[PDB]
Amino acid sequence: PPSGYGVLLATHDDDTVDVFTSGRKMRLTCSPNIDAASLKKGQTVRLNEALTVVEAGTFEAVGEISTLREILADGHRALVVGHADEERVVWLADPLIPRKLRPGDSLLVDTKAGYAFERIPKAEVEDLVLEEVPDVSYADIGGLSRQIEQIRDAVELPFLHKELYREYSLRPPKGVLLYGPPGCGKTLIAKAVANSLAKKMAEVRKSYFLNIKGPELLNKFVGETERHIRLIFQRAREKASEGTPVIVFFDEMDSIFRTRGTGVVETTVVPQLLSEIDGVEGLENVIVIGASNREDMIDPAILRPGRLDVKIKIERPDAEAAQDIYSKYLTEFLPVHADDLAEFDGDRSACIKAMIEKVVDRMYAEIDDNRFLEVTYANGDKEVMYFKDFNSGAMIQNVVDRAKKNAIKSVLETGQPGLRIQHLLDSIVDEFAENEDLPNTTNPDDWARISGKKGERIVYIRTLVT
């Protein structure tokens, strides 16, 4: 009753068959009941104490998973590469010799047995780096219309009108870069693009919008760092071959693909990235978009016409852009105290518009308390900076949040429901005084603009405070 097992290898004219068992390759004679003709290579067989083939099993579903490299000329052997580049030639099983075998497939293999038995598909790599962002649309973005129009031209139009582009022989833009001071809405534009792509794909009816951070694609091992990017680009090419647009978003491109000279592996990622981008230029549906705060720290090689042909700069909002952002945030659906409705006869829209105008005028006025920095020049006189010169959409959002928090405090304490204008009025000064000590609002781009305006290098900066 206790019986062993082995792996069949081949059949011979003398009705004897090769079997691999316990690391030993032997020749055995099958039992009269079992016919050697029906037996096939790679099939597990049952042995006994006398080493007699008494029954034939099936193909085992356990062992190592290896990558197929090529098929040998004889058609029965295949050259594959293991996990640690252990290249080996293995006989193919009977089911392997629709789906036809192709290079790069994952195959079950036993190195000890030396045979490959079955093919197992794995195409879940894109799901690891898939990122979904709902509840963002171009309607939410305020104060940015020129940049939104440009990004729509760089993404939506080539896919919408391919015939027009082919008529005028105009190559669709392949690379779009977004740069500017922090908090101006680069990630907001990126997520709006992602949501629009998801809506378009649902209309066609998602996974096509791949998003990756820089430090995500770094591995501690000596290898496998190139493999990740290779798999990403292969998956992008497969999605392009599906016909739907695919967008890969390298978020915060300052971390990786920076300048080569600066240093103290980052040396190899940028060249192979350039090679992959050049090799994927044939696919119109593959678009690479990256956002970066430090545009100077990036290698100038990639910032050339060709790969990254399109550049977009998002500047700090002015008065009208601030008004647009406030309109985007201060909606009529928030509770409003009856004091403000009394002056406007319950007209929420007009009252809110007047409140927005008032707060924008307050936060953009050259008042004494709005002085922020004292720029020092070597020869010219000193210059006074204002809070308006460092305005951003994030600051407006935080001001609105603080005003709402004050309104909640008021309705908790005095029980008067609604939002007062004084909430915004004093939240403005609170926010301005909170960021007075910190010179964090300054950015190298801001200093470059200031130095290029006045005409002298910045020598000293002083934080004015009373």
Partner: peptide, 17 residues
């Protein structure tokens, strides 16, 4: 151009047996 020291970061290696 002040001379500066360095601190390296090791990369893992794959070794069997």
């Amino acid at each position: 151009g002040s001379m500066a020291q360095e601190q390296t970061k090791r990369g893992g290696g794959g070794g069997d047996d």
